[model samples]
Target: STGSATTTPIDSLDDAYITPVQIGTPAQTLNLDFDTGSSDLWVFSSETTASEVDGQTIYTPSKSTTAKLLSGATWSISYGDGSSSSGDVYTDTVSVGGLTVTGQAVESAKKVSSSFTEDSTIDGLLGLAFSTLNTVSPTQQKTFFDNAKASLDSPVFTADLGYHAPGTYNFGFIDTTAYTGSITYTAVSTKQGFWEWTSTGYAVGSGTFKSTSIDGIADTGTTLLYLPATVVSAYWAQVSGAKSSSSVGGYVFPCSATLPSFTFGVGSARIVIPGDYIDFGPISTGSSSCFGGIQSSAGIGINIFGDVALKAAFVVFNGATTPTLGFASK
Candidate 1:
């Protein structure tokens, strides 16, 4: 039988730390990936016949005294990326850290791709991204966040992403100790799963030029903060020695000079990205070309903050409290 594929790009953040938890009765511990793109909880399954299942964790009903797969419900989902997986529905017990949600609906995407399987240090994905793009719609039974919401202390979910230290996902009231109150809050735009937002044009040193203000979105799922062509060109010109070097992604420059400092103002708070952060790589490539942390994502009027920007701040998601995106730092 021919099967389809789908890719789920996680809106990665920095400083967030997550620990594995037991699911089902004699529950097995599985890794968790907090995703802001889709809503649902899924893990690899024990019943999967594929040999690739080895070295991979699976929820075994026989071993787990309390675990049970949702009866006879087969499912298939395709992601935006070129990968996909399929399996039956399952429900048992679900717990993370000190949080627990009984009867959680989860997918057993049996045919995970090597990229999906290898890329994750965790066993499954805990989707806290959006309510609209949720696999469990008004028609479906439950979402991991939706189900766990009522049990949380103050209905707060906190993500403590460590610097290259893996990631953590927690439910209930946020551990205030994990956050810095001085963090700037950016109001979330009413976009779908893509947590998009607008930005004022970037800043480079103190160049004297007429302010050509532009608007763009901040996306965490993307790896780079892309800017418009006009803005990129203008900023590059200010670097003095900055000259274009070709790349598969885009242009890179061999700028010995200190790159400009660009700041993105969210609401009244401005996120200042310094020169070192701006020049990311010559990490590789045939030529000695280095890529700036910020690149030109023109044609698409959106700038994704990715992990670099996210690592520097704390993000709060309050589906129960309000329809908004809040920001802070840890």
Candidate 2:
């Protein structure tokens, strides 16, 4: 079986992408963020604290005839961004686009961090990472992707995230026309429950490619691209007056600074990211300083090929016995 759905950004900044999902017999639809970084299909639900539930939609398990409480089961998850959520568990019929999975774990949030409550854009997260990272205690649960993988035609999924535009997520089959040129394949190491891979190297602007192996994970849930401090510094240095000031939250440069394009390698394939994509946005609405989309992964301890880089190319998350990653130009 194959499924396709549109993942649209909730804001102009392209902070994150959300896809509509149907849960339960009556089909409670909610926009959920598809996260490849974390493995937990959690949501803001009827159990979420009243004060914690802002304007976002809630998933009421009681309303769904097929919803069944997972006896004595509970789950908690915290992201790299420092936000967390804790919830009780339920198994219900979950569907996206035309694909359906019975008894899919639906973790209903009992509490949420301020960030989740304040955004009010996404109702929950649909994890695409390996099931090993699932947070349910005593009895672990599988991710939505893992649960649906068996029924999928190819046990694969593809992400076509756009820059400030709607993107599509496909399961089971790769849409040939979603990208251009040939898809370059690379091996993935998922022992850590992440879509981790090693890039051949990177180059700033038209500079010579600094050949080296850079270990990183493809995290669609993260908003920006984070590389080794050396690489990040190399890119920001080209922009005059750019500073890596944590006070301002990260690397920042003059709004008018000409950001050079960033390029990374996958074997012989060189994925070029336009400089425009690096300019995240101004520090403030009328500020003369702007945030750099490419920042240092030094703080996080691991390089992250987040949405900033993912948006520049088409990616395939292959979930075979021996998992692999594929990249292509769009």
Candidate 3:
């Protein structure tokens, strides 16, 4: 898994993979992963030795009709989960659908961690976020959107969630008709690209959880919802066998038990999440403990409503405005 995303693969030769879309003209293809949180694109390349490269799937340029190395610019990436990869930069012609972006800078990792080398699908990440986070920050390089945006036709993008689904993220205009009416557009935080959120109130069945109601942001960048323990306990109370223990870190329920109805307020609206999604199981041997939305934290930091809370909701990270989050029905 190159970071949290998976890469598509070509079955033929050892390291050869095709690009998601055709290249320019006849269309040279290079394999890429779609990453939303970060706005940079990088790929594992030939200069990278097998041993130094960890879990990333290697992309062989020779297979593509055309491609170029990043020259000497070295690149490295570190993920929130402690995953990291290092590689040189290269220029190449990449395309998606019928859209093509030429003379783009792509990272080719020379040093990769085990998490990346062992990853079966991800060869590289093709970020679709705004140009603000583009690898070519100097304005010389083109991003996945910079090149393909013109070809987007209606200027709308869609993240087609699939089986195993893992889930997908999109940057740019959302197809309004894909869901209900229009998604409330939010403003982007000037300090960072994370969208700001406002909560009207939270509900567990008919009961409200918070006193003043909660306010925060939704981060697809994070894996779990980091709410408050008080809110979590109240939500779990509705479930028949659900129980909370200091040992379980709060809101630990019988994995097999039926989950309860839970929804949190987002502005004037609320999104409901089925109980089964609350339990994400244990992280590992050392950190072998159940986690809940209200995972206790000492600071007034951002509480990740996490993806579980988002699973049932059609999220609109309307960064177009910069400071608002809009939700709608799918």
Candidate 4:
């Protein structure tokens, strides 16, 4: 049978989209961030130290009759933003929408960084990347998608991330009503265990699309768009009061500064990021300053088409013999 679930933004935050998932017997429902950038299904759980609990809900494996320890197996992961989580492993039945995967590796966190503890709403991360990126020690684990793919009518899932709104994640089938025009397909390199692809070129505002190549990943966990230093600099140059500041860690512009829409290429398809989205809200309510949603991917060495970019289109993460990415306007 096919499966589908609603993905909703975190109210006014607009940072990430989350979907509900069920784990273990008796089914503990958790709102999980479905991230394509990393592989690991970790949740705040009874194993976490009390000090690390904060306001988040915990998954108690002991409460589920079906939860089984993976012997000495453990998992640890650190994201690009430095947020990390680590814990022991448990095998359980996990379900998303109507699709169920028995014997799924459910990593229960024993430790979490302040970044995660502070964001109490995010119960855990449901990784959609390739299984090779799973962080389990000694033995790697397959992701929910990897385990469910064999039974799906089509081994594909589509991400429809809405701007400050609710969207849907459809599995095994694509909803023709979710996107417009045709989906522009692009080859992806799973070697990095991410939905990594290459963009042929981009344009700033109304500027001509320059022919350049950029390698980047479509990361749903990240909030902003990241590009090479030179490319980011070129775009900021067009904003009247934009300046890069060490304090802000990136570029900031006057809240009133007029910004232009940014555009990137997918074959001949030009995906556009609206100007309003680029003004990622005020850096601080104390001053009339705002942060540029696009920043340099220098330290990371690879660009990221985070939520700011992904929300502009419907993305298909194809789980086929040769994995591919399909993009279309919403």
Candidate 5:
């Protein structure tokens, strides 16, 4: 069987993509980050500290007759630059799109950081990375995808993220009409529980494609495209008035500057990102300089093909025994 669900961005900047997942017996719906970067289906819950609960939805296991406490199990997760949460565990009926899992492990947050409390659109994260990355202690838990895969006709899921628009995540079967052209398949490394793959090369706008191969993860949780210093320098160099500012804390440029596009390869497949997408918006309201969507991944220890890159194409995470990733134009 297969399923589909729309993943919507919480803000104009497309900070992160959130999807609705039904939890518990009565099916309390909650908005969650469909993160492909981590493994753990966690939520803001009735168990969360009251002070930490802001404007987001919370999952109350107490209200569900199907919910059962997973004794001695606990989870903790740290994401992005500062966001983090930790808590106990519960087993409940969980549904994504139309796919249902009767005994899905759900992590219930008891503590959350300040970064998670402010600008409260995100509720929690449903990790799609790999079950090996699951943070549950005593006994690590399988992700929603892992628990549901045996029910799928094929152990695969697809992502079609958009800019200024809503996208869909499909489980199991591939939709023919979702994308154009042939899908390019490449081998994936799941050693770190990430959908890690090597991008063949990149091009800046209409520039020549470089043959430099870089290894990175296709992370739906992360918001920007982070590359090596050389690539970052090359991208910024092409734009006039671009500067690495200590004040802005990132590469910033004139808000009105016409930015060049970014393109990367997966095997022989090439995905092009629009020039305008590089401008993440002005650093502050009414500011003339805009923070960039592309940044240096030098200090980040790994190159990240985050949402900035994922949004450009239709991506497939083939979860078969020998996992592979597929990319196609939309």
Candidate 6:
């Protein structure tokens, strides 16, 4: 089976992308953030207190004949960005685009962090990472993608992320029209529960390319690109008015600072991030200080090639024996 879904930015902030997904027998639709950073298909549901839920829609399992509670099963997850959720589990029919999977584990949130509770439009998170990272207790569960892969014509999904524009997530087949040039494939190590890969090097714009290897994950859930502290420091140093701000908690620069573009290497392919993308809007509405989209990953423990970097390229999440990421210019 094959399917495709439109991916839309959450807001002017361009923090995350959402896609429609159907759950349960009668087909309750929810707008989910298709995250490649974690593994867990969870949603706001009946278990959540009414006062705790704001403008978001909740999935009520009692209304679906196909919903079956997994006795004593529970799940909880904490994201790299500190957002979290936890609740009971139910097995139900889950469908994305036109592709459907029966008896897929669907975790329903009873409690959620303020980060999630505040984002009313983000109904839930649809994790597209390896199932091994699933957070269910008593027994592990497979993700919607993993359960549906057996019937897919090709176990692959492509993410075309855009900046303040509509993009798409295609399952089973690659839409050649979505990208330009040939896709450069890079092997990934899934042992870390992510699409982790090593970069041959990186450079600031047309600057000399450094050959130091950097290990990181391709995460659609994260908003900014994270690199080592030293690398980030060097990039900001090139910007005349850039400085690490304790108040802002990351590198900040003048709103009009002339920023340099960044390029990451994967094998022979060079994925370039435009200069403007690095100048993530002003820190606050009238402030002349702007937060750098590229920041230090010292506390995070892992570098993240987030939307800021990924949106500049077309990404292919290949599910072969040796999982790989194929990149191409948009």
lDDT leader? 2
lDDT of 4 at 243: 93
- Over 4 Å off in model 6, which ranges? none
> For candidate 5, lDDT tens digit of each residue in 167-193?
999999999899999999999998888
Q: RMSD to native for every prediction?
A: 6.9, 0.8, 6.7, 1.0, 0.9, 1.1
Summarize candidate 4's per-residue lDDT along 108-191 as a digit string, tens digits.
999999999888788999999899999999999999899999999999999888888888888899899888899999999988
lDDT of 2 by residue, 176-249 (tens): 88889999999999889999999999999999999999999999999999998888888888889999876887
What would the per-residue lDDT of candidate 6 be over residues 1-330, giving only the tens digit for each residue? 898899899888788889999998799999999989989999999898777799998999999999999999999999877778999999999888899899999999999989998899899999989999999998999888888888989989989988889898888998988888999998899988899989889998789999889999999989999999988988988999789988888999998778899999989888898998787788889999988899999988999999999999999999878899999998
Backbone collision count in every prediction?
22, 0, 32, 0, 0, 0
What global local distance difference test value does model 4 have?
0.90
Can you give the lDDT of residue 216 in candidate 2?
A: 96
**Candidate 2, 323: how far from true, in Å?**
0.1
Candidate 3: TM-score?
0.70
Provide the lDDT at 238 for model 2.
88
TM-score of each: 0.74, 0.99, 0.70, 0.98, 0.98, 0.98
Question: Model 2 segments beyond 4 Å from truth?
Answer: none
| lDDT per residue (tens digit) for residues 171-229 in model 3 | 34464555665554433343443334556567776565553455454554444566666
Please give the ranking of all candidate structures by TM-score, highest first, separated by commas: 2, 5, 4, 6, 1, 3
* Model 4 residue 180 distance off true place after TM-score fit, in angstroms: 1.0
Which residue pairs collide in model 2, if any? none
Checking candidate 5 for backbone clashes, the offending pairs are none
Among residues 3 or more apart in sequence or in different chains, the pairs in candidate 4 whose N, CA or C atoms overlap within 3 Å are none
